Amino acid sequence: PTSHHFCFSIDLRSIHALEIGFPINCILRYSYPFFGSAAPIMTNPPVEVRKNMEVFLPQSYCAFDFATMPHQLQDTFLRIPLLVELWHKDDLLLGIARIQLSNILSSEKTRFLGSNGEQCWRQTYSESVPVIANNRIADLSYTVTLEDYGLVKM
């Protein structure tokens, strides 16, 4: 009776490599089971990334439709960072970026037409965060969006 219908999306738009020692065939990979248990979601195909160049990742957008109580979503986003692993495929795990999904909850929440054709309250947030080996080997630019469709329909 108090659960809401939400749609969340993440777009790992680009990676600007800095101090990875060598050119890599790159894929970014992540899981966030609070939206539903699943094998890791990955960008695809692997793309070449070389020192000091910004590369846009293919298949980098995913949306997630789920129902939960607003406090559960707020607590999970506050407590559990989304960890995005940067892998070199051939495979080596080069680094991880820790994204604090609660940053979007501090964004202005306004009434929008939602992606499903129904009204919603919408928030969005974009930033760049470092991908940590130990050292900072790359920067990941991303955007997240949260649609709140209100109480689950009867």
UniProtKB/Swiss-Prot annotation:
Reported impact of residue 97 to V: In JBTS31; uncertain significance
Gene field: CEP120
Role noted for this protein: Plays a role in the microtubule-dependent coupling of the nucleus and the centrosome. Involved in the processes that regulate centrosome-mediated interkinetic nuclear migration (INM) of neural progenitors and for proper positioning of neurons during brain development. Also implicated in the migration and selfrenewal of neural progenitors. Required for centriole duplication and maturation during mitosis and subsequent ciliogenesis. Required for the recruitment of CEP295 to the proximal end of new-born centrioles at the centriolar microtubule wall during early S phase in a PLK4-dependent manner.
Protein family per UniProt: Belongs to the CEP120 family.
Lineage per the UniProt record: Eukaryota, Metazoa, Chordata, Craniata, Vertebrata
Reported disease: Short-rib thoracic dysplasia 13 with or without polydactyly: A form of short-rib thoracic dysplasia, a group of autosomal recessive ciliopathies that are characterized by a constricted thoracic cage, short ribs, shortened tubular bones, and a 'trident' appearance of the acetabular roof. Polydactyly is variably present. Non-skeletal involvement can include cleft lip/palate as well as anomalies of major organs such as the brain, eye, heart, kidneys, liver, pancreas, intestines, and genitalia. Joubert syndrome 31: A form of Joubert syndrome, a disorder presenting with cerebellar ataxia, oculomotor apraxia, hypotonia, neonatal breathing abnormalities and psychomotor delay. Neuroradiologically, it is characterized by cerebellar vermian hypoplasia/aplasia, thickened and reoriented superior cerebellar peduncles, and an abnormally large interpeduncular fossa, giving the appearance of a molar tooth on transaxial slices (molar tooth sign). Additional variable features include retinal dystrophy, renal disease, liver fibrosis, and polydactyly. JBTS31 inheritance is autosomal recessive.
Domain C2: residue ranges: 2-114
Compartment(s) of residence: Cytoplasm, Cytoskeleton, Microtubule organizing center, Centrosome
Disulfide bonds: none
Protein name: Centrosomal protein of 120 kDa
Residues annotated as transmembrane: none
Subunit structure: Interacts with TACC2, TACC3, CCDC52, TALPID3.
